Design a protein around this motif. Structure first.
Motif, PDB file in Angstrom:
ATOM      1  N   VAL A 284       0.825  -1.211   0.000  1.00  0.00           N
ATOM      2  CA  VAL A 284       0.000   0.000   0.000  1.00  0.00           C
ATOM      3  C   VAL A 284       0.856   1.257   0.000  1.00  0.00           C
ATOM      4  N   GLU A 285       2.105   1.165   0.488  1.00  0.00           N
ATOM      5  CA  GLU A 285       2.966   2.343   0.539  1.00  0.00           C
ATOM      6  C   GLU A 285       3.374   2.805  -0.854  1.00  0.00           C
ATOM      7  N   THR A 286       3.414   1.900  -1.840  1.00  0.00           N
ATOM      8  CA  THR A 286       3.949   2.249  -3.162  1.00  0.00           C
ATOM      9  C   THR A 286       3.022   1.959  -4.334  1.00  0.00           C
ATOM     10  N   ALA A 287       1.905   1.247  -4.130  1.00  0.00           N
ATOM     11  CA  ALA A 287       1.131   0.761  -5.272  1.00  0.00           C
ATOM     12  C   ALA A 287       0.472   1.915  -6.025  1.00  0.00           C
ATOM     13  N   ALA A 288      -0.092   2.879  -5.290  1.00  0.00           N
ATOM     14  CA  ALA A 288      -0.812   3.965  -5.947  1.00  0.00           C
ATOM     15  C   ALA A 288       0.098   4.816  -6.826  1.00  0.00           C
ATOM     16  N   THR A 289       1.409   4.846  -6.541  1.00  0.00           N
ATOM     17  CA  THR A 289       2.381   5.620  -7.308  1.00  0.00           C
ATOM     18  C   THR A 289       3.332   4.744  -8.112  1.00  0.00           C
ATOM     19  N   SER A 290       3.142   3.427  -8.078  1.00  0.00           N
ATOM     20  CA  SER A 290       4.007   2.477  -8.761  1.00  0.00           C
ATOM     21  C   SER A 290       3.814   2.579 -10.275  1.00  0.00           C
ATOM     22  N   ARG A 291       4.920   2.706 -11.021  1.00  0.00           N
ATOM     23  CA  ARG A 291       4.787   2.685 -12.474  1.00  0.00           C
ATOM     24  C   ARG A 291       4.097   1.412 -12.946  1.00  0.00           C
ATOM     25  N   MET A 292       4.293   0.286 -12.244  1.00  0.00           N
ATOM     26  CA  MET A 292       3.649  -0.950 -12.688  1.00  0.00           C
ATOM     27  C   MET A 292       2.202  -1.056 -12.209  1.00  0.00           C
ATOM     28  N   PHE A 293       1.923  -0.646 -10.974  1.00  0.00           N
ATOM     29  CA  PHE A 293       0.647  -0.962 -10.343  1.00  0.00           C
ATOM     30  C   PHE A 293      -0.345   0.186 -10.327  1.00  0.00           C
ATOM     31  N   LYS A 294       0.099   1.426 -10.523  1.00  0.00           N
ATOM     32  CA  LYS A 294      -0.833   2.541 -10.374  1.00  0.00           C
ATOM     33  C   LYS A 294      -2.005   2.487 -11.355  1.00  0.00           C
ATOM     34  N   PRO A 295      -1.869   2.003 -12.607  1.00  0.00           N
ATOM     35  CA  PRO A 295      -3.087   1.831 -13.423  1.00  0.00           C
ATOM     36  C   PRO A 295      -4.084   0.853 -12.809  1.00  0.00           C
ATOM     37  N   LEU A 296      -3.609  -0.213 -12.153  1.00  0.00           N
ATOM     38  CA  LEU A 296      -4.517  -1.167 -11.515  1.00  0.00           C
ATOM     39  C   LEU A 296      -5.175  -0.566 -10.278  1.00  0.00           C
ATOM     40  N   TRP A 297      -4.429   0.260  -9.539  1.00  0.00           N
ATOM     41  CA  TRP A 297      -4.988   1.019  -8.429  1.00  0.00           C
ATOM     42  C   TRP A 297      -6.152   1.893  -8.885  1.00  0.00           C
ATOM     43  N   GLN A 298      -6.061   2.438 -10.094  1.00  0.00           N
ATOM     44  CA  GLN A 298      -7.104   3.280 -10.663  1.00  0.00           C
ATOM     45  C   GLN A 298      -8.240   2.495 -11.314  1.00  0.00           C
ATOM     46  N   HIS A 299      -7.961   1.332 -11.914  1.00  0.00           N
ATOM     47  CA  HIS A 299      -8.941   0.671 -12.770  1.00  0.00           C
ATOM     48  C   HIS A 299      -9.174  -0.797 -12.464  1.00  0.00           C
ATOM     49  N   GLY A 300      -8.468  -1.373 -11.502  1.00  0.00           N
ATOM     50  CA  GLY A 300      -8.613  -2.794 -11.249  1.00  0.00           C
ATOM     51  C   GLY A 300      -8.838  -3.151  -9.790  1.00  0.00           C
ATOM     52  N   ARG A 301      -9.514  -2.289  -9.043  1.00  0.00           N
ATOM     53  CA  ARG A 301      -9.726  -2.581  -7.631  1.00  0.00           C
ATOM     54  C   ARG A 301     -10.784  -3.666  -7.459  1.00  0.00           C
ATOM     55  N   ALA A 302     -10.545  -4.553  -6.497  1.00  0.00           N
ATOM     56  CA  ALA A 302     -11.420  -5.683  -6.222  1.00  0.00           C
ATOM     57  C   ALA A 302     -11.311  -6.034  -4.745  1.00  0.00           C
ATOM     58  N   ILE A 303     -12.234  -6.870  -4.277  1.00  0.00           N
ATOM     59  CA  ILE A 303     -12.223  -7.363  -2.906  1.00  0.00           C
ATOM     60  C   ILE A 303     -12.089  -8.883  -2.927  1.00  0.00           C
ATOM     61  N   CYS A 304     -11.247  -9.409  -2.047  1.00  0.00           N
ATOM     62  CA  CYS A 304     -11.112 -10.847  -1.870  1.00  0.00           C
ATOM     63  C   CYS A 304     -11.535 -11.174  -0.441  1.00  0.00           C
ATOM     64  N   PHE A 305     -12.717 -11.769  -0.279  1.00  0.00           N
ATOM     65  CA  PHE A 305     -13.177 -12.054   1.076  1.00  0.00           C
ATOM     66  C   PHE A 305     -12.556 -13.341   1.601  1.00  0.00           C
ATOM     67  N   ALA A 306     -12.477 -13.427   2.933  1.00  0.00           N
ATOM     68  CA  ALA A 306     -11.864 -14.570   3.597  1.00  0.00           C
ATOM     69  C   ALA A 306     -12.405 -14.674   5.016  1.00  0.00           C
ATOM     70  N   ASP A 307     -12.176 -15.836   5.624  1.00  0.00           N
ATOM     71  CA  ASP A 307     -12.432 -15.970   7.046  1.00  0.00           C
ATOM     72  C   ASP A 307     -11.309 -15.368   7.866  1.00  0.00           C
ATOM     73  N   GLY A 308     -10.111 -15.361   7.303  1.00  0.00           N
ATOM     74  CA  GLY A 308      -8.899 -15.009   8.014  1.00  0.00           C
ATOM     75  C   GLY A 308      -7.734 -15.396   7.133  1.00  0.00           C
ATOM     76  N   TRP A 309      -6.534 -15.069   7.597  1.00  0.00           N
ATOM     77  CA  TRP A 309      -5.329 -15.386   6.844  1.00  0.00           C
ATOM     78  C   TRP A 309      -4.293 -16.013   7.763  1.00  0.00           C
ATOM     79  N   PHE A 310      -3.296 -16.642   7.139  1.00  0.00           N
ATOM     80  CA  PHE A 310      -2.191 -17.296   7.827  1.00  0.00           C
ATOM     81  C   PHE A 310      -0.900 -16.504   7.637  1.00  0.00           C
TER      82      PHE A 310
END
Length: 214
Positions: free
Chosen positions: A74-100
């Protein structure tokens, strides 16, 4: 990140996120039944398109020869040359009970103290419904907070039901999503955790016992 559980029925995960009339997710009474969800598999992933919520099986991983990327910080994705388009156009939710997470090696299972599902922020390549084999989704991560720091230094960005719903809306910019990711993050005091069996480390094991306390 690296492993979570998504074992209950679709209706269990959706109750806090969306009224019936807003979903286009055909009814299926069978629990998803995945106690040990691993990168490189297809994972049911929630997103908004054509004003409704959809649930598509999406490859957990994102490759630009090495194994695909599975997290976006989260510290770099919104400004990442690779990820910032996905931050703008590819947001999604992955539901779970919990994580390991494994503490340097003893696995822990971390979940909401009120027992409600965790709504993990994801970004990925829209359209998600095409079944892409290489450009799938990633789980956004954050620094571990509060007690979570004695287990591991990273955690998934978990969003409140409110924030998760707003995260998914097409019409909100990457800048607004950055504001949502900060204010809507579920802080660690809302979680409980306990050690589980070391068997979860093998992706071949998938039983319900993998989330039980040891």
């Amino acid at each position: 990140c690296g492993r979570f559980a998504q074992s209950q029925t679709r209706e269990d995960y959706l109750a806090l996120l969306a009224e019936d009339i807003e979903r286009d997710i055909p009814y299926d009474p069978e629990p998803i039944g995945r106690y040990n969800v691993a990168p490189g598999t297809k994972v049911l992933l929630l997103s908004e398109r054509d004003e409704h919520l959809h649930l598509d099986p999406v490859f957990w991983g994102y490759a630009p020869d090495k194994p695909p990327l599975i997290n976006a910080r989260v510290e770099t994705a919104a400004t990442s040359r690779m990820f910032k388009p996905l931050w703008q156009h590819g947001r999604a939710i992955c539901f779970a009970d919990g994580w390991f997470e494994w503490k340097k090696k003893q696995p822990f299972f971390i979940y909401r103290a009120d027992g409600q599902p965790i709504f993990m922020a994801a970004i990925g390549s829209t359209p998600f419904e095409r079944g892409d084999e290489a450009e799938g989704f990633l789980i956004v991560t954050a620094a571990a907070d509060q007690g979570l720091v004695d287990i591991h230094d990273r955690r998934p960005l978990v969003l409140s039901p409110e924030a998760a719903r707003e995260w998914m809306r097409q019409e909100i910019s990457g800048k607004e999503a950055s504001e949502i990711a900060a204010s809507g993050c579920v802080p660690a005091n809302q979680f409980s955790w306990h050690p589980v069996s070391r068997a979860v480390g093998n992706v071949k094991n998938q039983g319900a016992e993998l989330i039980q306390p040891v």
